[PDB]
């Protein structure tokens, strides 16, 4: 009940490596963690696959059935596929339904471990696919495992706090709980017209009854560890005192990290780690999730470092991975250095957003 649970199996990793947008990323992440032998300090739990009924706790049957329809062959000619979000971002590959079921089940499993109290922290670095809607694939996400996990945690915990530190706005998770006060979503993300998914302004606070139970922090390009943590710590301090969560689901997409081809934020795993630490000291049942991350080595770097933070261990600077060693070139170190790119976040705009948010969180009681 003090040792973190690590959702892992060779079958699971093999399945997660098959996502066309992040090939072999899951293997790289586990391999680096395995090389630091951090999995020895964690209880490794094999993930179950989500049943149709379990997946249908959020996704509609029409969508799920269309998923397994095009999945049993790899059909890309179905006219209704585009309306179900399938296409460029989410290709109608073969076995994509088993893929979704596997990832969805892994997060449910992690949530189940929290419920049973075999751990306070449960890790699934291959999850956090927060863009998926109830009947629509979106942004590399075919199925919203984050939502399925929050729903499962609600069997035991009354109020769930969702924190989304991915580069992109966690719209799918926000929309799923937009109407309720039992789950509060907090998303820090890049907000600019044309940039996916296009939602998550500071004025988006939820609907009707989930009003002020959705928090969005629009950030611009070039932000670094220091300022990011100050914005994050500020929001989470107000959020915690106001919402008083019984359990936390934390998405940690590494597409904020410097060196990512999307080239927006200028973060290092250290900055994300401080956010992690602030959440961990709440001593609540925490479900750790991955997400974005399109520099594979850096994503492996980040999540391996974060796993070290959770274990309270300091990792050696030298990369000990042998299978994917060359990928960490040319310097082969765990640490990441930010780019020489300007921070387009003026301190007064940030101050405005923090005031707006604080004004919203006063209604939460």
């Amino acid at each position: 009940s003090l040792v973190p649970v690590y959702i892992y199996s060779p079958e699971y990793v093999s399945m997660c490596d098959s996502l066309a947008k992040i090939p072999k990323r899951a293997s790289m992440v586990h391999s680096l963690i395995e090389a630091y032998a951090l999995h020895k300090q964690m209880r490794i739990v094999k993930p179950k696959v989500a049943s149709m009924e379990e997946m249908a706790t959020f996704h509609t049957d029409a969508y799920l059935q269309h998923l397994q329809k095009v999945s049993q062959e790899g059909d890309d000619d179905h006219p209704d596929s585009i309306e179900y979000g399938l296409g460029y971002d989410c290709p109608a590959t073969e076995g994509i339904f088993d893929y979704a079921a596997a990832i969805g089940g892994a997060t449910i499993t992690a949530a189940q471990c929290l419920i049973d109290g075999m751990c306070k922290v449960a890790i699934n670095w291959s999850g956090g696919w927060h863009h998926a809607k109830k009947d629509e694939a979106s942004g590399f996400c075919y199925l919203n495992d984050a939502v399925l996990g929050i729903l499962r945690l609600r069997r035991k915990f009354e109020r769930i706090l969702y924190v989304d530190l991915d580069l992109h706005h966690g719209d799918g998770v926000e929309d799923a709980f937009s109407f309720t006060s039992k789950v509060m979503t907090v998303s820090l993300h890049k907000f600019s017209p044309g940039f996916f998914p296009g939602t998550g302004d500071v004025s988006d606070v939820g609907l009707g009854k989930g009003r002020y139970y959705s928090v969005n922090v629009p950030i611009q390009d070039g932000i670094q560890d220091e300022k990011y943590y100050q914005i994050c710590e500020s929001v989470l301090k107000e959020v915690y005192q106001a919402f008083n969560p019984k359990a936390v689901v934390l998405q940690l997409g590494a597409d904020t990290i410097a060196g990512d081809p999307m080239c927006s934020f200028n973060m290092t795993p250290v900055g994300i780690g401080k956010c992690l630490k602030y959440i961990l000291q709440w001593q609540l049942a925490t479900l750790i999730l991955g997400g974005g991350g399109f520099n594979l080595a850096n994503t492996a770097r980040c999540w391996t470092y974060l796993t070290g933070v959770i274990l309270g261990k300091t990792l050696s600077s030298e990369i000990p991975d042998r299978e994917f060693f060359t990928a960490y070139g040319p310097d082969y170190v765990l640490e990441i250095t930010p780019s020489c790119r300007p921070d387009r976040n003026e301190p007064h705009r940030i101050q405005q957003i923090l005031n707006y948010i604080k004004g919203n969180l006063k209604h939460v009681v």
Binding site: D89, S138, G139, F140, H168, F196, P197, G198
Partner: peptide, 4 residues
Amino acid sequence: RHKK
């Protein structure tokens, strides 16, 4: 609908 956007592209990611």
